[PDB]
Amino acid sequence: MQLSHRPAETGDLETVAGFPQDRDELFYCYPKAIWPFSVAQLAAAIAERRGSTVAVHDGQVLGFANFYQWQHGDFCALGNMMVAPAARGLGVARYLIGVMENLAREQYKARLMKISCFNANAAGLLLYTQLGYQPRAIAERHDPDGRRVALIQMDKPLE
């Protein structure tokens, strides 16, 4: 793919907010959100986070991610990882994760990137593993139906 990236803009909101296809996908990428997803919920996330970035191919916004934790000189934690349904498995997430790693190193002087992935998200767990992330801990969380899920906390040194 001929991918580029830039900071997320207002005009991208409607597109990105269309990416989660069901409650599970929304929970996996934004567990505080309530289905149905909306532009206002995405904009609120952006306002309270850092680094919101889109990946673009052939004029189309295909990916989005941000940081929900950032500690200068230490680490960032990547979240809100969303990819357009027509572009899944084509390398958009891996591209964007690489972009966000550079942004963490360069702008936050981070030595580590943290990613948390829910247990049900096999594709996520396998991709982050391919990208050199290692599992560090498992935490209990609850899904929207009040059922227990396992949040797998992974990390990777930067550089």
Ligand X SMILES: CO/N=C(\C(=O)N[C@@H]1C(=O)N2C(C(=O)O)=C(COC(N)=O)CS[C@H]12)c1ccco1
Q: From the list 92, 117, 125, 152, which residue makes contact with ligand X (rule: CB under 6 A)? A: 117
Nearer to ligand X, 32 or 111 (CB): 32
Confirm or reject binding of residue 67 to ligand X (CB under 6 A).
Answer: no
User: Do the beta carbons of residue 17 and residue 26 sit within 8 Å?
Assistant: no
* Token pair recorded at residue 77: 């934690």
DSSP readout, 6-64?
Answer: EE--GGGHHHHHT---SHHHHHHH-TT--SSP-HHHHHHHHHHSEEEEEEEETTEEEEE
Confirm or reject binding of residue 81 to ligand X (CB under 6 A).
Answer: yes
Residues 14-53, mask of contacts with ligand X (x by CB under 6 A): ---------------xxx----------------------
Determine if residue 81 is labeled as part of a ligand binding site: yes
Binding-site residues from annotation: 5, 29, 57, 81, 83, 89, 91, 93-94, 121, 126, 130, 140, 142
